[PDB]
Each structure stands twice: as C-alpha cells, then as structure tokens.
Amino acid sequence: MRIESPQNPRVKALAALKERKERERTGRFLVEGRREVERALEAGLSLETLLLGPKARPEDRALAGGAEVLELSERALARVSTRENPAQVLGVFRLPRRSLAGVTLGAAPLVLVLLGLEKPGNLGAILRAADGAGADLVLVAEGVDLFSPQVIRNSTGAVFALPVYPVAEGEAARFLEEHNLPLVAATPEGERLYWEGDYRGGVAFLLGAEDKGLPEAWKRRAQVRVRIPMRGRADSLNVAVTAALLLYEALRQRSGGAPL
Amino acid sequence: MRIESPQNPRVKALAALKERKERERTGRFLVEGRREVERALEAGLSLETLLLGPKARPEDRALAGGAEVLELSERALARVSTRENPAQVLGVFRLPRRSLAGVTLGAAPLVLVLLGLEKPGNLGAILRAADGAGADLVLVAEGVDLFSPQVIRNSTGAVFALPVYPVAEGEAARFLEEHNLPLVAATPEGERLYWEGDYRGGVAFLLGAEDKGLPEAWKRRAQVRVRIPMRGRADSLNVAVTAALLLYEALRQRSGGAPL
Numbered sequence: 001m002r003i004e005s006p007q008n009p010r011v012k013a014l015a016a017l018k019e020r021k022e023r024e025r026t027g028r029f030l031v032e033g034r035r036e037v038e039r040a041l042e043a044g045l046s047l048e049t050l051l052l053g054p055k056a057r058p059e060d061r062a063l064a065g066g067a068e069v070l071e072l073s074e075r076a077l078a079r080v081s082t083r084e085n086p087a088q089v090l091g092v093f094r095l096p097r098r099s100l101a102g103v104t105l106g107a108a109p110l111v112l113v114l115l116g117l118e119k120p121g122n123l124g125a126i127l128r129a130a131d132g133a134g135a136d137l138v139l140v141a142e143g144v145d146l147f148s149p150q151v152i153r154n155s156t157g158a159v160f161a162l163p164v165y166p167v168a169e170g171e172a173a174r175f176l177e178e179h180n181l182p183l184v185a186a187t188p189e190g191e192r193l194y195w196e197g198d199y200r201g202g203v204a205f206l207l208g209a210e211d212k213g214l215p216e217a218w219k220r221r222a223q224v225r226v227r228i229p230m231r232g233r234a235d236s237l238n239v240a241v242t243a244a245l246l247l248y249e250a251l252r253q254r255s256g257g258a259p260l
Numbered sequence: 261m262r263i264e265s266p267q268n269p270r271v272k273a274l275a276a277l278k279e280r281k282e283r284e285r286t287g288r289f290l291v292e293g294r295r296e297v298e299r300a301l302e303a304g305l306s307l308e309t310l311l312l313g314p315k316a317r318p319e320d321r322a323l324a325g326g327a328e329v330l331e332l333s334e335r336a337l338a339r340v341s342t343r344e345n346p347a348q349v350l351g352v353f354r355l356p357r358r359s360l361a362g363v364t365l366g367a368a369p370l371v372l373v374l375l376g377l378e379k380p381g382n383l384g385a386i387l388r389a390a391d392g393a394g395a396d397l398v399l400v401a402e403g404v405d406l407f408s409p410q411v412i413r414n415s416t417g418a419v420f421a422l423p424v425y426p427v428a429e430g431e432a433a434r435f436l437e438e439h440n441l442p443l444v445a446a447t448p449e450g451e452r453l454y455w456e457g458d459y460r461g462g463v464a465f466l467l468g469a470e471d472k473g474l475p476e477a478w479k480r481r482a483q484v485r486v487r488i489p490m491r492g493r494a495d496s497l498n499v500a501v502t503a504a505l506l507l508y509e510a511l512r513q514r515s516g517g518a519p520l
C-alpha cells in the first residue's frame with residue numbers, strides 16, 4: 001500500500017523520468033505539483049500513475065480516475081521530486097500525439113514563432129505570457145522539449161493547454177505562408193517601433209534566441225521588423241520579456257487601442 | 261602583474277568577495293563581465309583593481325584608469341569567477357555611500373516601488389526592464405543586496421545604471437508622499453486595465469512579491485489599482501514580467517500613445 005524505500009525498483013524507475021532519454025524510452029513523463037497535475041488532467045492528458053506523499057489531501061486520491069495510486073514516504077518522495085521542497089501530489093502521464101494538421105485558425109490569429117533553442121527558464125516564462133495574452137498558436141524549434149520538469153514547473157502547467165508545437169523551420173515557414181499570416185520580426189534594431197505595428201488583423205511575431213538572435217533569412221522574409229526601445233545602453237531584453245511585451249501590445253490594440 | 265596559481269593569497273581574497281559578509285567587511289565588491297564593468301565605470305563607481313583573463317583584448321587594459329591591473333591565468337580566473345564560463349574582464353570596485361535623501365526627481369518621474377523581498381532572480385530582470393523603459397527610480401525592500409554577483413549578472417549591469425534604493429516600507433511611503441506622487445497599485449484584480457491609467461505625468465507603480473502580493477493598506481492608499489488581463493487559466497504573471505509591461509505602457513504613453 002505504501003512504498004517506503006527510495007531503493008524500491010518502482011521508485012528508481014520514477015526518479016529515472018528526470019532524464020529526457022528515459023521519458024522518450026518509456027513514453028511517459030512526470031508531472032510534479034498539485035496545480036500542474038490539475039492542469040494536465042484538465043488539458044486531457046492520460047494519467048497512468050498518481051503519486052501521493054505523506055501530506056497529501058484526501059481529495060488528491062480522487063484525482064486518479066482509475067489510474068494506479070502509489071503512496072510514498074518522505075524519503076521515497078524526495079528521490080522522485082525535482083524540487084528542493086517535494087510536492088505531495090505527482091502524476092505520471094502519457095506523452096501525447098499532436099501535430100499542426102489539427103490546428104484551425106480564424107481570420108485574425110495571434111501567433112508567436114520562437115526560433116532557435118532558448119536558455120532554460122525562458123520557454124516556461126514565454127508560455128506563461130502566451131497563456132496570459134491569449135496567443136492562438138506558439139511555434140517552437142523542432143526537438144524542443146515541452147515535457148521536462150523545468151518547462152512544466154516554469155510554465156506552472158500552462159504548457160499543457162497552450163497550442164504549442166515544435167516544428168522544423170521549413171515547415172513552420174510553409175505553415176505561416178499557407179495561412180497567409182503577416183510576419184513581424186522582433187529585433188533590437190528593427191526599423192519600426194513595436195507600437196507602430198498594426199496587430200488587429202492576423203500577426204505572427206518572430207523572435208530569435210538569446211544568443212545568436214534572429215536568423216537573417218527570417219528577418220528578410222518578414223514584412224515588418226519592429227524594435228522595443230531600449231533607453232539605457234543595454235543591447236537587448238530577455239526573450240520572454242520581449243514576447244510578453246509584443247503579445248500584450250497586440251492585446252491592447254485588439255481591446256480598442258490604436259497603433260502609435 | 262600576473263597571478264598564476266589558484267592558491268595565490270590574492271586569488272583567495274578575490275574569491276572571498278563572493279560572500280556578502282566579506283563585501284561588507286572590505287567595502288569592496290567584484291564586477292564580472294566586460295559589459296558589467298563598463299556600466300559600473302560609466303556609473304562613476306571607483307575601480308580599485310582590474311582583472312584580466314588570458315583572452316582579454318588590448319582595450320580592456322585601458323579601462324584601468326590608474327587602478328592596479330592583475331593578469332590571471334585560466335585556473336586563477338576560474339576560482340575568482342562566479343560563472344561556469346568565466347568572463348575575461350572583471351573589476352573590484354569600492355562599495356558606494358548612497359542615500360535616498362540625495363535623490364532629486366523631475367516634473368514627470370517614472371517610479372517603480374517593489375514591496376517585499378522577491379524570488380531570485382526577479383530583481384535583475386526588473387532592473388533590465390527599468391533601464392530599458394527609462395525608469396527614474398526603483399525602490400526595493402530594506403534588506404536587498406544590490407551588489408551581489410547574482411543581481412549584477414542578472415541585470416547585465418543595469419543595477420549600476422539606475423537609481424535603485426533598498427528602503428523600509430515607511431521610508432518608501434514617506435518618500436512618495438513628500439514628492440506627492442500618484443500611486444498606481446498593480447494587482448490581478450485591479451478595477452482598471454493597466455492601459456487605462458494615465459502615466460503621462462509623475463507616477464509610481466506598486467508591485468508586490470510572488471508569495472504575498474501588495475499589503476492591503478498600500479492597495480487602498482493607491483490612486484488607482486490596475487490589472488494586466490489574463491485570458492487563460494493562470495491567475496498571475498511573474499512580478500518581473502508585470503514590471504516590464506507596466507513600465508513600457510508608461511513609455512508608450514510618454515511616446516505619444518493615449519490611455520485606452
């Protein structure tokens with residue numbers, strides 16, 4: 001009924017999911033935290049195993065929906081957790097099958113295109129901003145991991161309900177072309193202030209990665225290049241901050257505000 | 261001169277500066293990174309010792325301005341550095357004697373008031389945005405360390421480029437009153453959208469910390485409470501993201517934009 005040893009074969013296997021290689025091998029991933037488990041369930045992900053720590057609430061067990069439930073000791077729980085302070089509720093979920101083929105957009109979508117691999121921390125924060133501003137689609141680089149403990153924790157589970165898709169650059173470009181999305185490249189030296197863009201119709205914002213920045217080919221194909229002004233001698237802002245600024249400017253305009 | 265061994269007593273002394281207690285004891289702090297050293301120098305901070313790694317460039321030596329110059333070996337640099345990949349330019353600066361009493365504001369200041377201690381490394385991010393948006397003053401919590409390797413790195417040196425003062429709540433409240441500054445409280449349930457505030461005149465934005473939010477008395481005292489809309493399931497954004505959105509909304513209005 002209650003797994004006590006951190007050396008239990010079941011506990012070692014659960015702790016193994018901390019590695020992306022193991023998640024890919026098993027086709028499963030661990031969602032740590034009551035709120036994140038709630039979000040995965042509500043997003044429709046399939047719960048395989050519910051994990052309950054010594055201080056779990058009675059309601060937590062009722063989340064199982066017929067999945068296997070495991071009670072863990074503090075020691076066993078600490079082994080499985082990626083937190084300094086382990087959550088009392090965790091769930092092992094099945095990796096989902098999703099693609100862009102199932103995406104349908106309206107006449108004026110709000111789209112974010114994240115090019116390159118971002119520093120850890122940035123994707124989760126971007127996803128939080130996209131959730132807040134109500135982006136209709138987020139494209140990320142192929143091979144970006146949407147199921148790491150890091151992105152689950154840093155997005156506070158926002159990753160699960162958001163329309164976010166890792167896609168190869170060529171297919172991303174074709175998808176945007178096929179849906180006739182105006183591309184707006186965000187770059188520190190862009191010729192237009194970002195407030196002067198018109199985001200009341202469909203827009204796809206293009207953002208580069210913290211180091212290399214936006215690839216020259218993407219900058220050129222965009223119809224507009226916009227900058228966020230920097231009044232100090234700082235070069236650039238963090239990419240997640242930039243994403244939030246762009247998304248909420250679009251929301252301002254869509255809420256009745258005029259472009260500058 | 262050249263310092264080769266990690267065991268050289270100067271290297272141990274330089275490495276000791278990683279601790280706040282030692283910075284306080286010596287009246288000195290280390291600034292790592294060419295950009296960060298540039299900002300510290302441009303802020304008028306006193307450079308006592310310039311540190312150059314094996315791959316420093318000729319212009320770096322000319323930053324010294326009469327300060328002692330030490331050429332560190334790779335291994336000596338590794339011990340002094342707080343980074344995985346050490347910077348090639350670092351500087352030991354004198355801790356400045358600053359008081360909020362010496363601050364003078366103009367007719368239309370943009371002020372940020374950060375109440376309570378924040379998570380690492382929210383402050384650094386906030387200061388990057390404040391630098392970018394042209395904030396005139398940032399008030400932070402009483403115990404806050406503005407000279408840690410962490411805040412220097414996370415702010416990319418913006419902590420030097422802005423007036424930032426750690427103050428108790430009472431001192432912040434007195435300062436704001438005596439400058440007769442309109443207080444705008446940012447809170448997820450604020451009665452107005454943040455775009456609806458008028459920030460074309462002097463304004464101080466109030467932001468609370470993650471775990472608490474704003475003290476009720478501060479919220480009540482504010483001229484207006486404003487929300488950033490959240491269109492998804494998440495209730496709140498990260499405090500640093502919120503600060504950037506507020507600051508750049510103020511800049512938008514000061515750049516010709518109208519309140520929504």
Ligand SMILES: CSC[C@H]1O[C@@H](n2cnc3c(N)ncnc32)[C@H](O)[C@@H]1O
Pocket residue numbers: 186187188189190206207208209210211212213214226227228229230235236237238239242
């Ligand atoms: C080099 S930082 C990574 C990306 O963030 C975006 N970014 C950072 N700062 C700004 C800025 N001031 N204006 C527009 N985009 C920015 C750009 O898309 C960049 O490629």
Ligand SMILES: CSC[C@H]1O[C@@H](n2cnc3c(N)ncnc32)[C@H](O)[C@@H]1O
Pocket residue numbers: 446447448449450466467468469470472473474486487488489490495496497498499500502
């Ligand atoms: C980090 S979440 C808590 C703090 O960030 C600010 N904050 C976070 N989200 C919002 C929001 N949607 N609207 C206004 N302020 C917010 C508020 O000032 C709060 O004190």
Ligand SMILES: [Cl-]
Pocket residue numbers: none
């Ligand atoms: Cl609850």
Ligand SMILES: [Cl-]
Pocket residue numbers: 120121122123124125150151154155
């Ligand atoms: Cl992340």
Ligand SMILES: [Cl-]
Pocket residue numbers: 191192224225
């Ligand atoms: Cl243009």
Ligand SMILES: [Cl-]
Pocket residue numbers: none
């Ligand atoms: Cl340079």
Ligand SMILES: [Cl-]
Pocket residue numbers: 380381382383384385410411414415
């Ligand atoms: Cl910080």
